[PDB]
């Protein structure tokens, strides 16, 4: 029963710091890109779209552009890991990571930013 | 650029009656069911889990499953269609359909129930 898990579901972060949020999923083998979809959204803003190996800059929402990246190296370890640099106020909310790799599952993560 | 689209996003249905809600998705030529995942949820309750041609009635939530079905016939036309018979009160709320077929997309649909 393909599960995604969140190590931490609540992130308290400093304004202008850097953050990495993590979704873990089972990779019992060597990651097969033919099977892999990784999506990250925050309140209906598209953040990352990784589709079978394909990463499309064009669909990424204005805010996250040149601040958000998916750590590819980490994928191979079954860790969809979103790095957001220079955390702003508008960055606080519920994040969703959606994964499809054989089965499919998704999880939610809260971010709080201090002023 | 895989899109899921909804004909109607709001359904107002009468208590006890029957409803079909639909999610449409592109099906170039002949559906490959081995590559297809169709998921329906309502406020975190599992309604339908159709993974590669098997439906999973292990944990799928007993109030629905009792009245909820995926019309497989319609899949061939790129129509994920959830049929609920004898609409109850607990059936109102925001459903989500999540589809994976090459790409992946989801949509939300609101249901309201009347009782006259
Ligand atoms: C998550 C998931 C499921 N979930 C489940 N399936 C079966 C059983 C499932 C059972 C559970 C329950 N438990 C929880 C714990 C464990 O016990 C399992 C949960 N979940 C399931 C099914 C099918 C697809 C997905 C999924 C996977 C990966 C990615 C995306 C995705 N959405 C996008 C949305 C967009 C949005 N844009 C915006 C406009 C829109 C448009 O085109 O209309 C496109 C992009 C892009 C671009 N890439 C998008 O990718 C999606 C939906």
From Swiss-Prot, chain A:
Domain Ig-like V-type: 2-110
Tissue specificity note: Highly expressed in the heart, skeletal muscle, placenta and lung. Weakly expressed in the thymus, spleen, kidney and liver. Expressed on activated T- and B-cells, dendritic cells, keratinocytes and monocytes.
Cellular localization per UniProt: Cell membrane; Early endosome membrane; Recycling endosome membrane; Nucleus
Residues modified by glycosylation: 18
Post-translational modification: Ubiquitinated; STUB1 likely mediates polyubiquitination of PD-L1/CD274 triggering its degradation. Ubiquitinated by MARCHF8; leading to degradation. Deubiquitinated by USP22; leading to stabilization.
Intrachain S-S bonds: 23-97
Induction: Up-regulated on T- and B-cells, dendritic cells, keratinocytes and monocytes after LPS and IFNG activation. Up-regulated in B-cells activated by surface Ig cross-linking.
Disorder this protein is connected to according to its UniProt record: Truncation of the 3'-untranslated (3'-UTR) region of CD274 transcripts leads to elevated expression of CD274 in multiple cancers including T-cell leukemia, diffuse large B-cell lymphoma and stomach adenocarcinoma. Disruption of 3'-UTR region is caused by structural variants that stabilize CD274 transcripts, leading to overexpression. Increased expression in tumors promotes immune evasion and tumor cell growth by allowing malignant cells to escape destruction by the immune system.
Subunit structure: Interacts with PDCD1. Interacts (via transmembrane domain) with CMTM4 and CMTM6. Interacts with (phosphorylated) STAT3; promoting nuclear translocation. Interacts with CD80.
Known function: Plays a critical role in induction and maintenance of immune tolerance to self. As a ligand for the inhibitory receptor PDCD1/PD-1, modulates the activation threshold of T-cells and limits T-cell effector response. Through a yet unknown activating receptor, may costimulate T-cell subsets that predominantly produce interleukin-10 (IL10). Can also act as a transcription coactivator: in response to hypoxia, translocates into the nucleus via its interaction with phosphorylated STAT3 and promotes transcription of GSDMC, leading to pyroptosis.
Membership in a protein family: Belongs to the immunoglobulin superfamily. BTN/MOG family.
UniProt protein name: Programmed cell death 1 ligand 1
Gene: CD274
